[PDB]
């Protein structure tokens, strides 16, 4: 019922090997819906979900134009960043940008975003107020001064409170079959002997959307979050995600342990045990 739209961008320089690689993707929630890759033969932004395919030719031309212009700006900015950090022209560097908006159940803006990183670290970010900046260092402060002189924050604020929210709302409606449907996890516990003395209980969650989920083991009602191996939530490749949580238990003590599952597609949270 609350939703997000995000555009992610990455430029990576590669001296001696042409112009920087530029890749950008767009998501609504955990659903990919557009992509652009500068290294395709005649690059265009392409659809990746069925509900964006209905946008006409004019939509795809404007997006592609934006993608190509963003690439050229990034190319120049990478050269600029070499001056700001007194760096050599020899190595490969990375420029990332994310921007987008969150909306609440009634479609009003909850939060806007616009932030950059250089070489995997924070560079400059628009603050939640959409009117002021956080620069991470004295280099980013040069960008901040330029952006304050050109009133960039005010311009970003108009996009984020207006078009970002309005287009996110359109997409949520056109894609309501999938975007407004949560698939609950399919769950079970497996049992894996380590030795005669102990065994691993693994609690599984499969086939769920969106990605957000909580998986915990308890032992006679007490959380085990120093003994729980919890893997990162991972894509199945068919829109859904997977996750598991594992605890080592002594032989015979398996019924003291319960697994607890919270996901937005479930009526109530689940409580599971090993069932030989």
């Amino acid at each position: 019922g609350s939703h997000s739209m995000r555009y992610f961008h990455t430029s990576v320089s590669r001296p001696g090997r042409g112009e920087p690689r530029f890749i950008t993707v767009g998501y609504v929630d955990d659903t990919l819906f557009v992509r652009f890759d500068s290294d395709a033969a005649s690059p265009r932004e392409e659809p990746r979900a069925p509900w964006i395919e209905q946008e006409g030719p004019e939509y795809w031309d404007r997006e592609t134009q934006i993608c190509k212009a963003k690439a050229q700006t990034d190319r120049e900015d990478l050269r600029t960043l070499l001056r700001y950090y007194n760096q050599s022209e020899a190595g490969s560097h990375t420029l990332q940008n994310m921007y987008g908006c969150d909306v609440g159940p009634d479609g009003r803006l909850l939060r806007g975003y616009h932030q950059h990183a250089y070489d995997g670290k924070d560079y400059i970010a628009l603050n939640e107020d959409l009117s002021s900046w956080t620069a991470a260092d004295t280099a980013a402060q040069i960008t901040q001064r330029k952006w304050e002189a050109a009133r960039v924050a005010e311009q970003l604020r108009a996009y984020l409170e207006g078009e970002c929210v309005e287009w996110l709302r359109r997409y949520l409606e056109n894609g309501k079959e999938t975007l407004q449907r949560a698939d609950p996890p399919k769950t079970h516990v497996t049992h894996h002997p380590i030795s005669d003395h102990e065994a691993t209980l693994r609690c599984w969650a499969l086939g769920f959307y969106p990605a957000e989920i909580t998986l915990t083991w308890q032992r006679d009602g007490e959380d085990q979050t120093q003994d729980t191996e919890l893997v990162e939530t991972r894509p199945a490749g068919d829109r859904t995600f997977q996750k598991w949580a594992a605890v080592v238990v002594p032989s015979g003590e398996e019924q003291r342990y319960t697994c607890h599952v919270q996901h937005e597609g479930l009526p109530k949270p689940l409580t599971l045990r090993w069932e030989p």
């Binding site: 934006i66 600029t80 330029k146 960039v152 078009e163 970002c164 287009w167």
Partner: peptide
Amino acid sequence: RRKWRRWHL
């Protein structure tokens, strides 16, 4: 859809 405007670092 994407924003039209952008600004150099």
